[model samples]
Target chain A: MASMERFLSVYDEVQAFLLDQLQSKYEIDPNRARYLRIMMDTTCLGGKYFRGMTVVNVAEGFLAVTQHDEATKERILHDACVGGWMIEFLQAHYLVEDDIMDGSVMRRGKPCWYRFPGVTTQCAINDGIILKSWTQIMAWHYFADRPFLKDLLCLFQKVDYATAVGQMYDVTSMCDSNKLDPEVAQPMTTDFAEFTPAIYKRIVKYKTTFYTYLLPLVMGLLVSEAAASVEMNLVERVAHLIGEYFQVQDDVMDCFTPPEQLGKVGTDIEDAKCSWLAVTFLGKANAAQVAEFKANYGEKDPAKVAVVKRLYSKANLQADFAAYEAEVVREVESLIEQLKVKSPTFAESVAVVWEKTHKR
Target chain B: MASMERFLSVYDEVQAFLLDQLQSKYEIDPNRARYLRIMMDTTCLGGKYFRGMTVVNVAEGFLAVTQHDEATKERILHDACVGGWMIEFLQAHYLVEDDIMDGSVMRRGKPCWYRFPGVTTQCAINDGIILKSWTQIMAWHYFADRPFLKDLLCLFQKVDYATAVGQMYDVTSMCDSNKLDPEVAQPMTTDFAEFTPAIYKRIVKYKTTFYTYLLPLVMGLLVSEAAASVEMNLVERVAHLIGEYFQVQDDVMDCFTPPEQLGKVGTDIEDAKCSWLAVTFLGKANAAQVAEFKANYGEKDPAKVAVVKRLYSKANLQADFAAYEAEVVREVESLIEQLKVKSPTFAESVAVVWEKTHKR
Candidate 1:
């Protein structure tokens, strides 16, 4: 099958699985199920499916390596689509809450779920929780009595905890040793400088890596024939490196791409996000430029957006990003070599993630 | 040991279990661990322990009924505190998120965790998830290799999902009656009449009973010697019936009692809570009083508050609440008597909950 056909095929199965079977297990009755279905349609479906496809790819790849029979592989592959959707559901849960926290207006050009005209924070939080609970029930339905079920639950819990830790630090920008003390009773400033590279990688590992890159690989392997034989630590070690690059690319696209291309205007600047471009721009700016940055970086006005873009242009940041890409490519190559010690073409599985992510 | 000393001792043990063991399990580093500790201190530790104590009390009662030795009882009692704190942690998770949703100002005469200085909704959500993760880890710590651990995990997941469901309906006062079309967006007005006694009892069963009355009793039984041979569904059924009564009491207290006693001003009217008194009053009010209620019940004016008070007064609902207490006492007595089919003193356990809850 062609890649587009395979993608379309797998995603539809997932959509049905989420909207029907998962809904039954969640026990939504006729009266309230529409709201759940509406949320599923509006938020969970229609993503790029980059993170999602990894679940299927890794599963099929791992199952083949183990030489599972055609019928067994086919059955697991169907379940792999369920695994893929489970990850997508988890992603939806995060995005709904994160959009609220970051003051995001539109997601994929639609109003953030929390910001929809009639919705309130109360409904949003409870829905996120319901989304979480749905994933666990699906996990049980798909992998009950399997050895990897415990590991799957553990992986999700740990990832969520890490993501929360990363989000807290990133949102507050005050978890750093350099920031003001907690007990001093002072107001936290909006200074974005402490969003430095060291912290950037830390946040990426916590916030981005495990869920985006690591989880798909890990979950895919868990539900496949290779569940007993996979080396999770090595898979995780390299995925974090790969995830850092993935987020850097996302940060760059948030500014460099057209709003139409991205489906939402570049919000990292106005939202005061700890974006890669901000850290990269900070690294090269001179004292006068730095002063200008402190003044206008997170400003909401369209002129301020233009000013920051011009500053990036002045420093030729795109070229620097190009250089950093090469650096990470070398880093990824070495990590892939280390990862290949476990599964020879595991690097191939990871390469797909980068291509899908970068192709955006 | 004396009851006071035993209570203090068990609670301290529970507190330490929550802090130290939870830290290792979450893998929070030294720096981040402090914040977790602070959240634990503020939110998890201060509850009246009515919910928390149920774990220990049931465990002790269950073990004795099963005729465990003194040495075995001592050992199991210590682990029961772990179970107790795990339940308390679950309670904290709910309250933290619930407070933010309700726009609560003070919890136990202190700021809600979400309302703490320098905290955002992001941290509040994460901390609650951490509190949730901590319970599963603590369950594993205390009950790993035990027969009922899976049941415990299932129980928690089920309860939390039911809670999120009940909260959505109770918060919005909307559940389409197999009638509304999807394309037509309609306003969901707050209607207190829909907050009928039947609906009130249903919501109470979901929102209150499972976690508050039912969960601790079952979890305690699960980890106790009686775990090998106990009728949980029977126990759960009556506790839920009693939990319905407990929440009916709470709904009465919210509007009837002063803010000083409840620790915050009663905004059940403004917040549009499904209060028991409001539902009862709505049932009895004359057309003019009902019209007056529809206008002023949830209004924000001081005069509006007075008007709603007069409406409730004209209906003579105070005597009704007194009548409800007697009905509930009979209700509790029968449920407890039915519960005695298993544990002879299960009635005593239910009575303890009533005394702790009702005496307030």
Candidate 2:
């Protein structure tokens, strides 16, 4: 069995390979090259690599059952790692374009890609397209000799189509202020309570879950030559639930976590994003608190921030977030226990989800 | 042989089908529907459909050589038409996005797609992406039952990649005016003179000619099950020369042709593009004329326009444009004569080229 230390080393190796590729292929000059390098490095640093780790974990589980030779096991794990890297690449693509579209200043504790000197905002958009194209090209070239190459291509295409649809919805949803209550001159607290949390969860699921979790698991299943039966469904269902939990935690930590520990400043407040805690606070605020929240929600005043924080404190939004997190984890754990009749691979996958939930 | 009138009707059918697809698939409401319909209609109205016509022409040429049945010939022509439309669709895609990026106000005597009320500026970008994606999807779906489906997919992918690279160069060339100036810019102008007139031609070859002209010819060849040893190189060389001549004339017409006759305001001046006339004018301009030329090139002032027009008049730019047009047509004819030893299909293709050139 591979130890956590070995897994970490493998990640470092893959990260190094990616860095080398970017340097050799995309680097232009010292200054411009450093900017590209930093952008690449920040993407690697942003995520827990949960989707990528799942690929390694599932491949390990597959090998245990198949009793594959060392070489075969290595090959499967490498492919899974590539799939994980694709998720990261896709996220970077979205982030780069989003930064340009939203005119965001900072990302991952550094200036956004377009904000860098000498880099045209237009290049950032083109870079996003190139990044997505690279993932497609990589999938085709790397797995050209694989048994399920066509199926894998089809899978990636489907994921891309769905991702595009999700993006279209995301852009459309923010188009107007029809959702905002004119009476309150803000998004109604009840409206936030009912739909805001679900909206965030859905965005995370559509944008992250399938590519990060389902794709890698399915790739592992394909490698193991597993039948598309109950086992596959169980894997998908569990992974999705875990993905939801991971994003919910991310939303909570954005506001509550210490800056140094979190490694970046969060922008949920500034973005006016429909996050879980924000919704809860809005929902439970008293009349004076509601008035205070409405006055400060989308504005950029430090005093407004203090007022909103006071309202959140009064509503115990953090406590509400903690309760939801616990409830979801418990629900997932019980579901995993019920899947005892499935392959041992399911058990290993469940264990990985628990690790991610508790990880820093 | 298909009569010109018959060919025109077939082109109209394709245009009508395209408009119907846009209306039914893209219409979200009355306002949205009107915008979608107008955008597609404007794009369709501007195209000559020569690239598409080439496909039909070439396919018929192949049929003449092989003695294929009418049904088989019709199938070849239909597929060729689709390929031709694909080229037109791609042109529209680039134009829509380019209009947004360039902040163009009018196209084909109508508001640009992005200028439509309720359609956010970002819609132009997204719509372009959708158009490209639709072209790919349609190509795949249309060719699913064909033996050369994979080849067709590869062909479209190559065309898109080449067109994108050219567009990147085109965009970069205009942005870095220093690189596009005399010395680097002077040599660049020669290259542009040699190549820029051929920009639309090259795009047509990839985006239009090969798919429209060669595709039908090749499909006819396939249907007849003829040997693949046909004189394709001679055809390509002749086609490219003729295509270049056709585009150069179009550029001339864009500058000198009246707006009522042309159906749109000329964009060449405002775009600061390096057209055949622009390069030729610069090449022939005196020191003072060049200074005046640079000052008024991209400025939207009546005085500047008059000064630029005065310089062109003094330099005999219109005469230069006319002479170049005649020279190119003569060159194409000479090439056609050389290729007459190959096949009459080749001669017929040359005839098609002459017909288009004479229309101007």
Candidate 3:
């Protein structure tokens, strides 16, 4: 709660800075600038702020243990806030494109930015590019004074590449054999034979973990010079574990969370998304349930989605997820216990991210 | 021809290097890696190699003037090849996304990447991201030892931002007023009043010039440390002049060039693209011609496009372009004449790009 509150306080200022720079520095066309301003508001704000907050939380964790003057601490927090928002913008870049790719409808309780009257697929594509460009721009613009600016820029570039590679794997994994309709390109091409747990983990790690988990934490370490004190390999190991767990949790929430509470309609079943539940359902389902899932999966109709969710419930996926969540929590805690002996506050940073996980 | 041949010689090796890195270094899944390999071939290769070769040409010019040993010159040329291909990859990235945005069918005489049955909109979107990712990866990977790596990276980022901003201006300029369609989102929102010559220049400057002309020349300078010898502002001024002319010529070629010779179907009129011909046509048209042009513009039907082309023919926009071209050539030649006084070899570099212009 404290980290969230602290991260929340800086959100407006960062947003203001970005919007102002578009006009004052970039000198963007007024018409296009207004469109981008709305896009920034629509996509960048109103998130759970978990990724951004993780940067702040981790930085604060280091601040508690490190010897720094108040002025230095203030500078660290400010730059961390910027780093936090940079990740948020990067995620926004992915989500904007992902929504169009997935043919998604709602996001954060509002119509997807692409679905708005003026912004169809084309503007949406360009908007994604705009978001991505800004992420790099912010990295260079704000961190111009830092000696490690190249390191910061490379981190963003590397994670961005990793996430795209993961997305390629995810999209290629979902193939569509239904050739009846010229327009409707349904992806029934999922070679369930190759749909091993390894593939699933690879997808989650590359697609979700790199950007969602590793980026914020590593950015925090870079900002605080915390990597000098902590074991980076251990941090990366715990990050991978936590990131995979976080993605699995996200998959669970996508299916089980109430639409009103989740702030968006669940479409993983309808979108033929490569989610944990789908993979696990395939593993656990009997021949009959498998047939039902195959019939109902990726269907656009609500009745079809209901059938798929029913099979998910019938297989007791929620119970399975509960056990899986507990196991990951235990494993990560044990790793942090080792981390605590070396650097207690660094362990506290990892724990901050861990505590935010498994939310209903 | 010499620069082009020298630039051409490095193409396969650069590509092989990129493909090898995708698998060997990134450790990408073989399937997705294969998809990216084809994508690299599909989008990145078979171009005129003008942008990439510009780096070579300019670097060679610097070589012509500077007192460097054969070894140093060889190293400069090699690095310029990498920098040249980096721009090629960057342009490929834009083209992949731009094709989708424009609903384009042909690029470089082949079906657009998105038009491939297997590579639909989702895959196409991700493919664009992949191309963009590798440009950065190639930048960092090849330029790792260079002290000016940040400058090179930032150059790519700035041009990317500028191009996207230009695209936004362009897409927004063409507004669709036809409200009848629920699905087809046509852009008729272009207010004719704001579609001024200045706006056209602005759009071309941002969208085409920055990436097409400025990037390669600046990259050449960066690679050869030629920026220290030449006046940067004058180089930028020359680049703007040459880049705007190149875009105008491209627009003319889109309309005027033969389909067989041009290697792709022209759809500027059909897509309602904001180009020099459209802007010039509006400026010179009578009320009746304006009405006919407006009616035929942005229509997808073949007959509608024919009507639009007929109007272009009647207006003699090609002649307009020829005169404009001659004037720009004279102006640029005069500038280069001045450039020769300070750096005659750099003048030769500028002439190389100029000579490539105005082809059938």
Candidate 4:
């Protein structure tokens, strides 16, 4: 609660700072400034801040192990929050762009940024570009003087590249549906032959894990200046495991959780999105079940969605996921044991991020 | 001819390198690799490379002033080409995204990347992200070990930010026309009250000047390691002059140049773009002319387009632009004279970029 509270406090502060910076940078064009103000408000705020909090939590764990002078600790903690907010900013970039890509109408229980009164699709595209650039812009603002500034900038770029590649896979995996509509189904032209479990894992690792899970954790280590001491290969492996876990949970929750709890209706079913549940159900179902699943999977009709949901339940997928989570916990625990031998603090920091995934 | 030949030769080489890099990075996802290769071909190639040649020519000017051993000089020249290609890649990023934003169909005499057979707008958006990421990705590949890596990376980031800001102003300035159609006009709800020459200059400076002119010049200086010795403020001022001159020329060419000579039909009139011609004509026109201009400016009908063309010609905009270009050259020459006082070699390099802008 304390960490969450501190992380939450910085949200407005960072937003206000970026807004002020926008004014100074774009003072000559008041319209641009105004558009950006609305952009900052609509796109960059009101998230769960899971990625941001992981940065703060991991940074704190590393700091706790080293006895910094109070003044220095204060500065470091504040900087950690800044790093956390940067993760949030990066997510905002993805959110705004992805909404336009996915034809999403609602995000965070509000209209998509593109659907706002004055921001049509054209402004939204530019706004999304601006949103991505803010990550670099804000980096120059905060990290310009640091010795590890290059490392930080390169990390953001690398992750961004990875995420974009992942999105390419995710998008291309879908049949060419109505890019302008989210509520109805178009006949999917894509075959499910490529929807193997391995491909699903690839998508999750690149799309979900890299940015959502790996980035903030690595950022915390980098900001702590502990990056050089840790085994990057091990950190990346842990990220993959945890990221897959988080995404699998999301897949389950999207269908099972009430709409109010999930905050948005799940279109993964009708959108023909490649999810862990979709892949797993396909992997386990027999010929007749597979036939029914295939027919109902991408349909927009409520009855078809119900059939898919029932098929997923018939396979007892909820229990299967529970077992998978147990296995993931044990495997991650063993890896943490290995990591603990090298760096106990690193292991503990990993634990902080891992604990937050127990969403159920 | 020599500089242009060298610049053209490197296009396939850099493309090959990026493609190879893409394969290695995304070997697990063949679809994204394939998409990127298509993206590389569709967007990154076939440009005139005006921005790219500026990098090479300016670097050559600076390199000639200093006596480098032949072997060292060879390496630096190749590095300059790499830098040049980066500018091309950045331009490709803008081109692909801007095409989608403007609902443009043909670009560089082919279907726009978004309009290509297999790519819908969704894939194009992600492709654009990858396209923008290529600038940083390739920077890391080439400039990783260089002393000015941060400067080069920051330069790209800053220019990208500036261009996106410029685009925001450009997009928001236009009335919401059919985003899905480039050939037609919508009944514009936007008034011309905000259309002023100052705003026109703002659009060209930030949109056109920053990336197209200033970037390649600064990149040349940075690659030459002469950035510290040069007065950047003067370089930027000169770039603004040259860039505005270039855009205004484009506006005139759009209307006056033959379709065969220009390679694409001009749509600045129907697009209602904030061009120098629009503001200049508006500023000087009588009420009747202004009313006619307003009524016909953004219409799709051939007769309506002709009315706008007649209105532009009635103002003798070609002659006005000719005078404006002459004034720009004189003003820029004076700045070059000031620049020569500090660094004669730098002045020569600026002259190289200046010489290219005489497009007619």
Best candidate per lDDT, number? 3
Higher-ranked by lDDT: 3 or 4: 3
Mark the regions of model 3 whose C-alpha exceeds 4 Å error after superposition: A1-21, A24-27, A176-191, A286-296, A301-304, B1-10, B24-27, B176-191, B301-304
Query: How much lDDT does each candidate structure score?
Result: 0.71, 0.58, 0.80, 0.79
lDDT comparing candidate 3 with the true structure: 0.80
Chain A only: give the TM-score of model 3. Answer: 0.89
- Steric clash pairs (candidate 2): B55-B212, B55-B213, B181-B185, B182-B186
* Native contact fraction (fnat) of model 2: 0.00
Q: Candidate 1: where is the Cα deviation over 4 Å?
A: A1-29, A67-71, A174-193, A301-305, B1-31, B67-75, B141-144, B174-193, B225-228
- Tens digit of lDDT per residue, candidate 3, span B1-360? 365666767777777777777677556655555566677878888877889988988888778768988898888998899899889988988898989988887887788888876678888898888888888887887789887687888888988998898887777666632331323455474446655688788878888888888999899989998777777777878888988998887888888799887788887887777789889999999999988887788888999899988998999887887788889988898888888877888888888788876452
RMSD of each: 3.5, 7.3, 3.6, 4.3
Clashing pairs in 3: A175-A189, B175-B187, B175-B188, B175-B189, B175-B190, B176-B187, B176-B188, B176-B189
Interface-residue RMSD per candidate? 3.8, 9.4, 6.6, 8.8
Q: Rounded to one decimal, what is candidate 2's iRMSD?
A: 9.4
| Residue B76, candidate 1: alpha-carbon lDDT | 71
DockQ of each: 0.39, 0.12, 0.41, 0.35
Tens digits of per-residue lDDT for model 2, B223-314: 33432535667666765565555555666777778988776777666566655667678777777877777778756776776676677678
The DockQ leader among the candidates is 3
**Which CAPRI level is candidate 4?**
acceptable
